[PDB]
Design a binder for this molecule. Sequence first.
Ligand code: CLA
Ligand code: CLA
Ligand code: CLA
Ligand code: CLA
Ligand code: CLA
Ligand code: CLA
Ligand SMILES: C=Cc1c(C)c2cc3nc(c4c5[nH]c(cc6nc(cc1[nH]2)C(C)=C6CC)c(C)c5C(=O)[C@@H]4C(=O)OC)[C@@H](CCC(=O)OC/C=C(\C)CCC[C@@H](C)CCC[C@H](C)CCCC(C)C)[C@@H]3C
Ligand SMILES: CC(C)=CCC/C(C)=C/CC/C(C)=C/CC/C(C)=C/CC/C(C)=C/CC/C(C)=C/CC/C(C)=C/CC/C(C)=C/CC/C(C)=C/CC1=CC(=O)C(C)=C(C)C1=O
Ligand SMILES: CCCCCCCCCCCCCCCC(=O)OC[C@H](COP(=O)(O)OC[C@@H](O)CO)OC(=O)CCCCCCCCCCCCCCC
Ligand SMILES: CC1=C(/C=C/C(C)=C/C=C/C(C)=C/C=C/C=C(C)/C=C/C=C(C)/C=C/C2=C(C)CCCC2(C)C)C(C)(C)CCC1
Ligand SMILES: CC1=C(/C=C/C(C)=C/C=C/C(C)=C/C=C/C=C(C)/C=C/C=C(C)/C=C/C2=C(C)CCCC2(C)C)C(C)(C)CCC1
Ligand SMILES: [Cl-]
Ligand SMILES: [Mn+2]
Lengths: 50, 153, 77, 34, 56, 335, 28, 65, 38, 35, 37, 38, 112, 341
Amino acid sequence: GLPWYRVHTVLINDPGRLIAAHLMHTALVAGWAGSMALYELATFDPSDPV
Amino acid sequence: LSGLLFLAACWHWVYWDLELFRDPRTGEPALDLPKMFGIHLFLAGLLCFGFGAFHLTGLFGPGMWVSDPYGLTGSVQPVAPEWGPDGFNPYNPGGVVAHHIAAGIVGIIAGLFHILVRPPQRLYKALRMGNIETVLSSSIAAVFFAAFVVAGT
Amino acid sequence: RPFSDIITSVRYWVIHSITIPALFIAGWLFVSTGLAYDVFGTPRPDSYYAQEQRSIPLVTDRFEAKQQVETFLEQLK
Amino acid sequence: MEVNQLGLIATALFVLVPSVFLIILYVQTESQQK
Amino acid sequence: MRYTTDEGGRLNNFAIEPKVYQAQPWTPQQKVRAALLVGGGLLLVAGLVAIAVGVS
Amino acid sequence: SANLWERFCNWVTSTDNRLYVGWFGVIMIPTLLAATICFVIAFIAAPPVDIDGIREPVSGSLLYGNNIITGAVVPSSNAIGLHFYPIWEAASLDEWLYNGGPYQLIIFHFLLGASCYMGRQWELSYRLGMRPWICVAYSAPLASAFAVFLIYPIGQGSFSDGMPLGISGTFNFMIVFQAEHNILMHPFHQLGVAGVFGGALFCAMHGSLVTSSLIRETTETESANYGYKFGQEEETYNIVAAHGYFGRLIFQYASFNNSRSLHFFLAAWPVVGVWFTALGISTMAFNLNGFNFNHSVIDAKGNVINTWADIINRANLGMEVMHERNAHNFPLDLA
Amino acid sequence: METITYVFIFACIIALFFFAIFFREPPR
Amino acid sequence: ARRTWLGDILRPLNSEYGKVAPGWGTTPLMAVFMGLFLVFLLIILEIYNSTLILDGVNVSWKALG
Amino acid sequence: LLFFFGHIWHGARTLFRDVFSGIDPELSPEQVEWGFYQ
Amino acid sequence: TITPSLKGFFIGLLSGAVVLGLTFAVLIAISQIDK
Amino acid sequence: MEPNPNRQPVELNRTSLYLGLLLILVLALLFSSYFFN
Amino acid sequence: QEPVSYPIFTVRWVAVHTLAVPTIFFLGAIAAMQFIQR
Amino acid sequence: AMAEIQFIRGINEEVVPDVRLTRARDGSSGQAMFYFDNPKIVQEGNLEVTGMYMVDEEGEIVTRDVNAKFINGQPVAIEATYTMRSPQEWDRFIRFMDRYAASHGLGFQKSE
Amino acid sequence: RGWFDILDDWLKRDRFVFVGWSGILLFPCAYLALGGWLTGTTFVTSWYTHGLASSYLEGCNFLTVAVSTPANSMGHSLLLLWGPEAQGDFTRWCQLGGLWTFIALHGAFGLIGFMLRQFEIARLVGVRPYNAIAFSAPIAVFVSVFLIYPLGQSSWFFAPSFGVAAIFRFLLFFQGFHNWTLNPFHMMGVAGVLGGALLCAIHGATVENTLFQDGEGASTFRAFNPTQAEETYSMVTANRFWSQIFGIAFSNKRWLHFFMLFVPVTGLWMSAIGVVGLALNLRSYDFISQEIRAAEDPEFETFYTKNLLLNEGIRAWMAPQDQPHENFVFPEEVLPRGNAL
Ligand code: CLA
Ligand code: CLA
Ligand code: CLA
Ligand code: CLA
Ligand code: CLA
Ligand code: CLA
Ligand SMILES: C=Cc1c(C)c2cc3nc(c4c5[nH]c(cc6nc(cc1[nH]2)C(C)=C6CC)c(C)c5C(=O)[C@@H]4C(=O)OC)[C@@H](CCC(=O)OC/C=C(\C)CCC[C@@H](C)CCC[C@H](C)CCCC(C)C)[C@@H]3C
Ligand SMILES: CC(C)=CCC/C(C)=C/CC/C(C)=C/CC/C(C)=C/CC/C(C)=C/CC/C(C)=C/CC/C(C)=C/CC/C(C)=C/CC/C(C)=C/CC1=CC(=O)C(C)=C(C)C1=O
Ligand SMILES: CCCCCCCCCCCCCCCC(=O)OC[C@H](COP(=O)(O)OC[C@@H](O)CO)OC(=O)CCCCCCCCCCCCCCC
Ligand SMILES: CC1=C(/C=C/C(C)=C/C=C/C(C)=C/C=C/C=C(C)/C=C/C=C(C)/C=C/C2=C(C)CCCC2(C)C)C(C)(C)CCC1
Ligand SMILES: CC1=C(/C=C/C(C)=C/C=C/C(C)=C/C=C/C=C(C)/C=C/C=C(C)/C=C/C2=C(C)CCCC2(C)C)C(C)(C)CCC1
Ligand SMILES: [Cl-]
Ligand SMILES: [Mn+2]
């Protein structure tokens, strides 16, 4: 039945799956931090800072 | 860190039926929201205290980034805390060290408090606690308050 | 109670046809005696400019602001 | 004039990703009836 | 569980909230089990203002 | 066959057609179809159009280096004035493209077609036997288009003073118009602004109030058609906090207590508004400008005091001098 | 580069018009 | 359900679940902490804004001097 | 500024919960019907 | 020691205290007469 | 595992596709001018 | 709504007197401003 | 009577509804559905409805959420709903309904 | 019953106008803002903070008066009366533009009280609070343009002054410096507001012409005012007309009245995003391709380059006395002119 703006309302009545989702969001955030780090260490120039 | 988190997330999705999350007098899921906020406030407070007292101070950590007014010679150095009325100078590093110690102690105090007192009835019925959708309501307000003030700072 | 009935009730008339003119006249004298200009700090229309100056009074410091206005007003600007 | 090589990739992704998302939901709920 | 919204034949879900319950005055076991925690708290915050005085 | 005319009249006036094609519609499809085919070809690929008659052109086409926002169909040359300029009055195809021919084709067919749309509206509503007044509410955008595309050009003396058909072209027209006539201080433009903000506002109010009161709606459906009992359930109570605000403002201003004045008022507001500004644009076509104040405050020393009106006059002057390549000796002008 | 992208997006709007008129969902 | 060791250890930590101390409780005590916090926010807002000047504090970059 | 709209939407959905759904969580689901008919 | 702006803040919170004290005081009084 | 009891399906009917696709393709036409610069 | 007896202070009473008295003072101000010679 | 139902204060509704009285999991809560078949307020009037007031010698039970049914623009029925969330409120409603059904008629049923 | 409950019930009594808890913040703040503007357009000067005249006392008509912003030399000051710049002196406080901040902040609190009033009324009646949600569009607009934007510029001087001509000046200033019409978020806003007015007119007309019993000696009487309508017409008629003219129609009334709510509200939200972008002076002024082509080739003219020339003019001829605290003086051989091109 659910519209496209009610799909994550099936976690409301069980915490186990809610925590699965929350752990997942956290994985993505740490991954983005690391991946973005590595990427701009490939474009940073340390010879001249001034 | 992401790899480990992805695995634990998988673990918590396949195993979803754990009686901890149920309450067994009626066998249907519920949380104990005041107790949760208290536990996590205790953790938040102790981490804030540790971060201020060991990392920022340079007591065992490296300290923080300090500069001169014109930003010519800046470097990483220890910082002493400052609790006088010059600690609310928002261009004084010391105010930041003072804040994390102090805020941490408030966190410990309040965190213990919320384990050892239950809510009163008038608030529990007013703010409609026991409904996980109200915790979210409060958190969004806090989170956008924080974003606005860091945008300005 | 409809407003029409209390507006043409004798209790209204006996006090209010005495107080209404008093308010109108109090406003009229607040302007006509020159006082309106002295309370809200609005300049008189012969005096926006000093004799010496052809430049506008303009504020340039926030903590010595009232000082700068006090100075601008003595030179009749 | 200099037209970006990456302006084209933004355009391409901007349309193609949401369109295939909605289309997959639609065919999924059509096989829900039949 | 929640079966809702025949507007388009649709679904919407909402929380199941626990029942309210007026507390019972504490047993002496509950008092002494609580006493350990608050006493621990007292000395813990004392010790941290102590570390705070040292690091300045 | 039954001899094609009888079949043809049934075909045209049928209301079992998926899209009604009336007798207004019979004029409407060729005109609108010509207008749009010419428009898209011209927008993409019409070569630059000289617009001041000095042999310096402006590019509005997309294959000549524009994007969606900077492109336009550029108006007719200033040399032409208000002359009717069909393609057989030119002597070559390239010079008809160089003088801005197509723009006139588009707008003439567009106004014919958009009028026939109103006609087609009136006719269909007459066939179903309902109060035919959807058409008078549409007559407001239609009045507006006459005012902006046909009348202000005629009043000024040329179709070179028309609105370009493009995104940045409209912005250019608006800014230059404010520069020459001071539209903001024209009270009719103010009525126009009021009308469209108030329309948007009453749209949000009406929608919000109605969707809070509806409960469930269902009407019986068959395997070929619809039912005859439209079921509807709503809330039927309100409080005295929408009685000092809504009740004794609306019962007093609508001049009725009846609910049927709601939907009458909803459409009246923006329609009146857009008529008023549509009228105003035409009065400036004969150069009746809006209020402007210069030197409305002077002190008793004989020195001038400025006010906000004078700042707007400065900004207007700034725009207006930039618009004038033609000469630096211009004292008092237009048209 | 840019103009092909522009006309392609245009073309699929007008196609979507055609689809909305002659293939609407039968409401039952 | 899935009987498991860490779940049984954490079991007594989620076992009150809707219990409340009668009536108003410490609402009047909350209001005291609440008000103090608002007054604190005003003090540290006006110091930043240079509307409250407290001698010996200089709100500029030149305090890293 | 977007999290502002977020805040009001969720703040509404928790206080007006009893009207967004027809049922009240105060009531435990209904188990047995009584009538009243002439 | 006290600076003038600090007195000004003290003035400020004292007028704040007064005006809310009054508003709730008269509303509590007005409500509890005609209850 | 044992089936989740909170499993519900997800809907999207044709007219929502039409509307949604219109919005996607239209939004692309507005912002593509700025992406290409 | 508000009792017909109407004691001297009433929610209605203050509402119509905080929009009556300043306006009669202010219209008397503006009227006087009309006869000021520029 | 010694119990009656009004939708507007000061005048009585003179049409008698059918009532579903549902019991929650053993009685501390429940909810009552009234169905009114073409009441007098639905035929005539211009006074704003403000909930349903169940008035009797013991006071008032005031409830909102009164709905109407319109068919082709004709209002034909009113639905009203009251919810009981304390045993006090619940047994209170049963006593009011006993006084109402006794004074306006007629029987009462139950099904298990 | 305790004193809190007696007080609470008395605030929720049946009156001509509802007061409620939200009224307690609403009515003082709104009244004082409204009176503050009324006494400012009537007595208070602007002669020391802009060198302009904008008062009936100074002699001006309805359209050219304003309550005007403070100077640029005041920074981001709150301008309290007891603060260290007016130091408790009324005349200085009106002269320095302190009345501007009075209106802005009290009006923000009036708006907060009003959305809370909508919630409170909705909950005691028991309807959904959708009209409060609709009212977040004005608040978005207000807090983005009267509060967030000046807190990004340099002072409250570029905040929009309360007045008719004073806002007309804002429009030209935005048209000239930021080129606001070319920003996409404002494009989306114009479309939304005009679209709201469009749905308003069409709805209003097509409900009026499809009523049940437009003759027949209408035998329906209730009304039932809160319905607003939405059974006094046949939906089937309406659908069947529109589905032939435009080739599409609604078939569900609920979604129509939600679309009407959706359109003008989304419009204002997109524009609110746009102007919080301008606060950091992040604008789209130009397309880089057109500038490089125009630098390489000066036989290139478009309606967009033309806009750039006009904007270039607005700034230089308006600025020296729009921003007098910058003390620009521009010779008349350096001011832009079309005939120099
Ligand atoms: C703009 C309107 C708006 C609306 C509709 C909501 C709605 C709501 N909020 Mg929210 N809130 C808002 C703005 C708003 N909030 C803002 C801007 C903040 C600050 C970030 C908060 C922070 C907040 C929190 C954290 C919580 C709520 C809660 C609530 C809900 C509880 C009941 C209630 O009505 O409280 C409304 C009451 C208030 C908003 C209090 C107003 C306080 C004032 C008048 C302070 C004045 C201070 C001082 C005298 C003057 C300062 C001067 C200044 C220049 C320095 C609720 C309906 C709770 C909730 O989520 O409920 C589910 C909860 O956890 N509110
Ligand atoms: C609902 C009531 C209400 C609200 C919300 C406001 C809101 C506001 N008013 Mg205001 N005002 C009101 C009614 C109200 N007004 C009334 C009725 C009057 C007429 C008498 C005024 C007259 C007035 C003036 C003349 C001015 C304002 C100003 C202000 C604003 C600036 C912020 C400020 O100074 O906060 C003041 C608030 C505080 C300092 C917080 C007080 C907190 C309290 C009560 C707690 C104290 C506890 C304890 C004793 C503290 C111990 C501390 C210790 C431990 C150190 C703010 C917009 C000024 C303004 O807008 O400047 C731009 C301004 O000029 N007000
Ligand atoms: C397990 C510990 C851990 C540690 C030590 C770090 C360490 C680091 N992370 Mg990190 N991170 C972690 C886990 C960790 N990460 C996790 C789990 C996530 C995913 C959610 C991330 C996501 C993350 C991101 C996205 C980023 C980092 C970055 C960084 C690095 C730069 C410093 C910084 O950004 O600090 C700045 C930290 C702050 C400003 C924190 C402010 C905290 C707020 C405002 C809390 C207020 C709420 C509180 C409860 C209020 C009440 C308090 C109460 C006590 C009274 C630092 C090397 C950055 C980087 O360079 O990555 C390469 C970056 O962009 N982290
Ligand atoms: C002796 C101990 C001590 C000391 C020296 C400090 C020192 C500090 N604290 Mg503090 N604090 C302490 C104890 C202490 N704290 C304790 C015990 C608590 C409670 C646990 C707090 C709670 C606290 C809070 C809540 C905050 C601080 C912040 C800060 C610091 C920033 C100063 C600044 O930049 O202002 C910076 C900014 C302001 C003064 C503005 C505040 C704005 C307000 C309150 C309203 C926002 C309104 C609206 C949502 C915004 C719209 C914006 C839009 C118009 C653009 C400073 C380093 C602040 C911080 O981290 O800022 C970055 C902050 O917000 N502390
Ligand atoms: C902060 C956390 C938070 C959380 C946990 C929720 C949780 C929820 N919201 Mg809420 N919401 C939030 C923030 C949040 N929201 C914000 C900031 C707003 C303001 C815009 C809203 C406005 C909102 C509305 C208006 C509604 C919800 C609804 C919902 C529920 C529906 C399911 C869903 O996932 O949508 C399903 C997924 C989509 C709609 C797809 C979104 C595609 C987008 C636009 C983003 C793509 C990814 C993005 C670019 C990643 C970066 C994020 C950025 C913030 C950094 C869900 C329980 C709905 C509800 O209550 O259902 C009953 C409902 O009507 N939310
Ligand atoms: C021709 C078409 C057109 C249209 C349709 C729009 C549409 C819009 N423009 Mg505009 N604009 C245009 C052309 C157009 N623009 C041009 C050519 C320019 C030249 C540069 C501008 C420059 C411009 C600027 C500079 C700004 C806009 C803004 C806006 C938007 C905000 C909504 C609004 O009106 O807020 C109006 C104000 C409000 C909604 C606040 C209402 C506040 C309250 C409720 C006060 C209380 C009222 C009352 C006293 C209470 C009564 C009580 C009583 C009944 C009991 C809207 C999206 C604004 C915007 O997007 O901001 C986000 C903005 O800052 N526009
Ligand atoms: C400039 C255009 C504009 C104005 C003037 C305006 C006005 C208003 N909108 C309201 C509401 C709304 N507006 C809505 C949507 C919209 N509103 C829009 C545009 C506007 N809305 C748009 C475009 C939309 C579409 C999305 C909705 C959905 C609502 C409502 O629900 C609401 C309402 O109740 O409508 C009837 C009213 C709030 C009444 C109230 O109790 O105020 C409370 C505030 C008070 C009493 C005072 C506030 C503070 C003051 C005095 C400061 C401002 C400055 C002064 C007035 C000084 C003069 C300023 C000069 C420029 C003239 C008010 C008449
Ligand atoms: C080669 C070529 C030619 C290239 C193309 C060149 C070109 C110029 C391209 C333009 C691209 C461009 C710049 C686009 C920018 C605009 C853009 C992206 C806008 C959309 C994004 C946006 C603004 C979103 C937020 C605001 C928003 C939601 C606005 C909505 C606007 C909107 C659709 C308004 C409604 C219009 C409309 C006609 C509605 C009529 C509805 C209707 C038929 C109702 C009839 C009806 C009424 C009743 O009352 C009842 C009862 C029934 C039953 C019933 O049926
Ligand atoms: C000032 C402009 C020129 C004069 C007014 C023109 C009104 C045109 C309305 C067009 C709206 C779009 C069509 C949809 C709506 C539509 O179909 O309405 C139709 C309606 C007439 O139909 P009714 O069914 O109401 O009446 C049956 C008639 O046949 C016999 O009475 O029009 C009016 O009543 C117009 C007002 C005349 C009576 C009032 C006096 C005129 C001034 C007051 C109202 C108008 C101005 C102020 C409004 C805020
Ligand atoms: C398993 C494992 C592993 C691996 C893992 C990995 C490999 C990871 C990574 C991860 C990652 C690497 C991730 C990433 C992610 C990302 C993301 C998540 C992103 C997002 C984004 C966004 C969200 C955006 C947005 C936006 C846009 C797009 C535009 C505009 C702006 C914005 C911001 C809006 C290891 C071996 C180690 C260990 C063992 C196990
Ligand atoms: C500032 C201030 C304040 C305040 C004050 C106030 C609060 C005031 C008020 C005031 C007011 C409150 C005023 C009023 C005024 C009004 C008027 C002046 C009116 C007029 C009107 C008329 C004249 C009418 C007209 C019309 C209309 C409206 C519509 C239609 C048309 C006609 C013509 C009929 C305070 C003390 C707090 C503090 C310090 C400062
Ligand atoms: Cl030009
Ligand atoms: Mn011209």
